[PDB]
Amino acid sequence: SGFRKMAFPSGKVEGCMVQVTCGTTTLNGLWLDDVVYCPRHVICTSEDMLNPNYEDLLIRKSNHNFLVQAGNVQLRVIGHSMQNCVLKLKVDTANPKTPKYKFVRIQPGQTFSVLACYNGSPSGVYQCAMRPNFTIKGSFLNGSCGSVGFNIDYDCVSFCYMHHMELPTGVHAGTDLEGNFYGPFVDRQTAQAAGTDTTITVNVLAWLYAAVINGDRWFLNRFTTTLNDFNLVAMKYNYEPLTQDHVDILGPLSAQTGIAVLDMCASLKELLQNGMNGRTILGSALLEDEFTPFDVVRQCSGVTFQ
Amino acid sequence: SGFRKMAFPSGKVEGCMVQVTCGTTTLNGLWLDDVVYCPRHVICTSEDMLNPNYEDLLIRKSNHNFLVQAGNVQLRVIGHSMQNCVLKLKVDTANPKTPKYKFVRIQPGQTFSVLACYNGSPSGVYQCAMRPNFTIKGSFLNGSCGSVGFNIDYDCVSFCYMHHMELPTGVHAGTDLEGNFYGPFVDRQTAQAAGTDTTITVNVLAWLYAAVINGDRWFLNRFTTTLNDFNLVAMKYNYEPLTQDHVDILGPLSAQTGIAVLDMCASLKELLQNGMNGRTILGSALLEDEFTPFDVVRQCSGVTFQ
Ligand SMILES: *[C@](O)(C(=O)N1CCC1)[C@H](C[C@@H]1CCCNC1=O)NC(=O)[C@@H]1[C@@H]2[C@H](CN1C(=O)[C@@H](NC(=O)C(F)(F)F)C(C)(C)C)C2(C)C
Ligand SMILES: *[C@](O)(C(=O)N1CCC1)[C@H](C[C@@H]1CCCNC1=O)NC(=O)[C@@H]1[C@@H]2[C@H](CN1C(=O)[C@@H](NC(=O)C(F)(F)F)C(C)(C)C)C2(C)C
């Protein structure tokens, strides 16, 4: 029993982290096969960052201008190209620790583990959600750019996030591994703000199922609701609409507990309308929305990785 | 910016996890050099567990009775002995992935990362505190016994916890790597309960410093207090006494922020007496006590591991 925000084991990703320096800018790179992937703003000085012309800055770089270090070992750069907001450095050594991997662009609402790195070395690991407003609530200091986010399925690392920047409120923005930002952000130092965020409804419901499995059942009421009249209430409290796909995804937890999804929706409605009256659910005094249904199933069933 | 419950990168520990089976009991083992360490109750059937005589059960085991699997590879057991509540299986192969390591018995109040494992394979990683009542608030299903807890300093893994059992309330108990339990628990299936717990005061203060560093400063008042009159208030709200050692340990955060520890103690007193009035600190609606001063410094300074 027990329910914790749990990160994927990080070892397969740790083996891919390197340091990339261009001029006086150092950040983290991801070494897979014979390519190193990093944020393109490694080629900027601080000055350059108010409004860089990346294509122009890169024209003036040679291979040798990129110092790539994997612990003690310099990897010689033999080629370079830019894809969207990501720089790809071809190197003369294939990473022997390259795991089975994919690049995935995740959907808002989905979770992933971040391996926070400085100077190519890991600091720690923690689980995030891609917020509806295309930010994550991370922990990132100067030097963390190029740290990645990932999911593990069995033996396969699905990389979904590379860290680029911090927005007002201390939330974070970045790209997929093809260098396309999540959300409307650009890699320039100018005024940008996150859109107003929403609460990931399907994830709150998944977490209420986790509470039930763990024996925390006080908030269960005797009523039901329609999907329509639940969604009107959700709209008021800035909760995203629950779709039938969401209902179907919650099917395994609903079956395991014997609680119909629409009955759990009734229970949530009452929590939204009445508050928690100083009570906690799973240790928490607020409703948690950064656990997916899959996260709950994984954690409450003991799913492991190879 | 940002502040997250952050686990140590797990890769060095992942390389040490194995599966141990004796009869029909399978759990996790820790493979370091040519020794595998696991809970001694691997030698029990379910039946045996109401009141095992471990010394007697072990007398009747041969080396061959222990099946140790490291992924695909069976490791042949060539020796076995029991130390307190831990079984040590000498094997014919030294683990080539053995990191630099130590066994440490941590103090109540200190934190560590748990690598949750099933069948010798990692499921995920998360940070815990050794509670004043010698439990941890973990996430452990049947099959997780033998999962370990650890700290990383630079290149060195300090193992401090091996998982053995779950108590009422869904909290967890286990041993150091010399097989001595934390707290008064015994490895038998009988009625045991955790002592009433207390709040780790020094850790709450460390977390209030983290909030200040992150710009969440609303709870700072204009007053100070004495260590004596703070500690009277703490006693009422079931907070552990703050000692001068604790004050000295908070020195780095106090210096960095310019807020004297006794001034922060005044601010905490008011939060304890008046509540938070529906406000949050660092996203949280409750006071958090599972960050040590070192954890805050590490996270807010970007300390990394080799
Ligand atoms: C990242 O570039 C880094 O770690 N580097 C470069 C050498 C090491 C850095 C990470 C930031 C730093 C502040 C604390 N946490 C972080 O995640 N990114 C970075 O500095 C990016 C970078 C230029 C600006 N920038 C920012 O994050 C800006 N943000 C904005 O300008 C914003 F308002 F749009 F959000 C701040 C430095 C003001 C936080 C570019 C976007 C190219
Ligand atoms: C652990 O032995 C395990 O994972 N195994 C053995 C084959 C795989 C198991 C972990 C438990 C299981 C329940 C969910 N979470 C856990 O952490 N430990 C285990 O079963 C231990 C073991 C015998 C009893 N026991 C318990 O945890 C008991 N607890 C008690 O008896 C208690 F009240 F004292 F706390 C329960 C099974 C009732 C939870 C021994 C202590 C030797």
Outline:
The structure is a homodimer of 306-residue chains. Helix content of chain A is 23%, strand content 27%. Chain A has 306 residues and is an alpha+beta fold.
Structural summary, described in words:
Two copies of one chain form a homodimer. Chain A is α+β, with helices and mostly antiparallel strands. Chain A folds into three domains: 1-14 and 100-197, Beta Barrel (Thrombin, subunit H), CATH 2.40.10.10; 15-99, Thrombin, subunit H, CATH 2.40.10; 198-301, main proteinase (3clpro) structure, domain 3. Chain A contains eight helices and 13 strands. In chain A, the strands form two sheets. In chain A, strands 5-4-1-2-3-7-6 form a seven-stranded antiparallel sheet, with no helix packed on it. In chain A, strands 8, 9, 10, 11, 12 and 13 form a six-stranded mixed sheet that branches. In chain A, a hairpin with a 2-residue loop joins β1 (17-22) and β2 (25-32). In chain A, α3 (201-213) crosses α7 (261-274), α3 runs parallel beside α8 and α4 runs parallel beside α7. Chain A is elongated, with a radius of gyration of 22 Å. Bound molecules: ligand X6O (2 copies). Chains A, B: Residues 1-306 are cytoplasmic. Chains A, B: Residues 1-306 form the Peptidase C30 domain. Chains A, B: This is 3C-like proteinase nsp5. Chains A, B: It is found in: Host cytoplasm; Host Golgi apparatus; Host nucleus. Chains A, B: The active site is at residues 41, 145.
**Level-1 CATH class name of the largest domain in chain A:** Mainly Beta
Percent of residues of chain A in helical segments?
A: 10-25%
Summarize the biggest pleated sheet of chain A.
Answer: 7 strands, antiparallel
How many helical elements of chain A?
A: 8
Number of domains of chain A: 3
General shape of chain A: elongated
* Ends apart, CA distance between termini of chain A: 23 Å
CA-based gyration radius of chain A = 22 Å
The chain pair with the largest interface is: A-B, 53 and 53 residues
Which percent band covers the strand fraction of chain A? 25-35%
Strand order, main sheet of chain A: write it out: 5-4-1-2-3-7-6
> What is the tally of beta strands of chain A?
13
Q: What bound compounds does this protein have?
A: ligand X6O
What oligomeric state best describes the polypeptide chains here? homodimer
Write down the secondary-structure element order of chain A. HEEEHEEEEEEEEEEHHHHHH
Structural class of chain A: alpha+beta
The CATH homologous superfamily of the largest domain in chain A is named Trypsin-like serine proteases
PDB class: viral protein
Keywords: SARSCoV2, SARS-CoV-2, coronavirus, Main Protease, Protease, Mpro, 3C-like proteinase, CL3pro, Inhibitor, Complex, Covalent, Adduct, M2006a, Ketoamide
Assembly: dimeric
Entry title: SARS-CoV-2 Main Protease (Mpro) in Complex with ML2006a
